[PDB]
Amino acid sequence: DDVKETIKKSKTIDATKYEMWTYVNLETGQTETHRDFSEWHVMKNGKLLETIPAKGSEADIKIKWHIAIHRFDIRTNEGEAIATKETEFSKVTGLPAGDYKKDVEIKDKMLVGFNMADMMKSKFTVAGMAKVNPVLKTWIVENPMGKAPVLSKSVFVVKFKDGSYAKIKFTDATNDKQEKGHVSFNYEFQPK
């Protein structure tokens, strides 16, 4: 009558587009996809050349949400994370103590527009500002160009702004045709 039931589910997110974030509610399973909200910056010959106006805002997101995914970049909604040494959820007892890390801001670094014709002209587009979690980024050990990504086997724990938390184990970074950016994970979420 006073501890809410744990929500144990799997999800598959299409994060293939450089332009987009997918916002994920782990309590309800709802998702929403929106174009990145920053001012975009075209880099040409190693310097900031052109701007593309900022469009929309996070107020356009209707659902509550916990994590968001852009390609293999993972952020939280003002949350914090650790990578445990465990490989199985049953070995992570409760909310572990540890050195939890909040999301960081990265300037003119996250790709929002990328193709080979422009790359050969030394041109590509980045988010003016973006938020990414430096612990969750480690879910990928290696991502060699043209080749299979290598995933961490660690269980992550993420603490959310309402006091909830989840154990998360990532299982796939490609679909069954080996297309990169289809991100799958299992999780166990404790509601408050």
Numbering used by the authors: 5 to 196
Task: Reproduce the article's own wording on this structure.
P. gingivalis is a heme auxotroph, therefore it must acquire this compound to survive and cause efficient infection establishment. Amongst well-characterized heme acquisition systems of P. gingivalis is that encoded by the hmu operon, comprising HmuR, a typical TonB-dependent receptor involved in heme transport across the outer membrane, HmuY, a heme-binding protein, and four proteins with unknown function. The work presented here substantially extends our knowledge of P. gingivalis HmuY by presenting data on further structural characterization of this protein and novel data on a second member of P. gingivalis HmuY-like family, Tfo produced by T. forsythia. The comparative analyses of HmuY homologs suggest that not only the HmuY hemophore-like protein of P. gingivalis, but also T. forsythia Tfo may be engaged in heme acquisition.
Similar to apo-HmuY, apo-Tfo exhibited topology typical of all-β strand structure, with the main distinction apparent in the fold forming the heme-binding pocket, where two long β-strands in HmuY that form one side of the pocket are replaced in Tfo by four shorter β-strands. As compared with apo-HmuY, analysis of the 3D structure of apo-Tfo confirmed differences revealed by spectroscopic analyses, mainly in the fold forming the heme-binding pocket and the lack of two His residues coordinating heme in HmuY. Tfo lacks the two His residues that are required for axial ligation of the heme in HmuY. Instead, Met, Lys, and Tyr residues are potentially available for binding the heme. Based on spectroscopic studies, we assumed that two methionine residues are the best candidates. Although the apo-Tfo structure exhibited a ‘closed’ form, partly caused by malonate binding, MD showed that it could open up to accommodate the heme. Comparison of apo-HmuY with apo-Tfo showed the same kind of opening of this region and it is the ‘same’ loop, containing Met149 (Met169 according to the numbering of amino acid residues in the full length protein) that moves significantly compared with the crystal structure of the closed conformation of apo-Tfo. Importantly, they demonstrated that heme can be bound to Tfo efficiently under reducing conditions, which favors coordination through Met residues. Moreover, reduced conditions influence properties of iron coordination to methionine more significantly than to histidine, thus allowing efficient heme binding also to Tfo and heme sequestration from the albumin-Fe(II)heme complex by Tfo. This effect could be explained by bis-Met heme ligation in Tfo, which results in stabilization of the reduced state as compared with bis-His ligation in HmuY. However, to date we do not have structure of the holo-Tfo, as 1.8 Å data collected from brown holo-Tfo crystals only reveal presence of the apo-form of the protein.
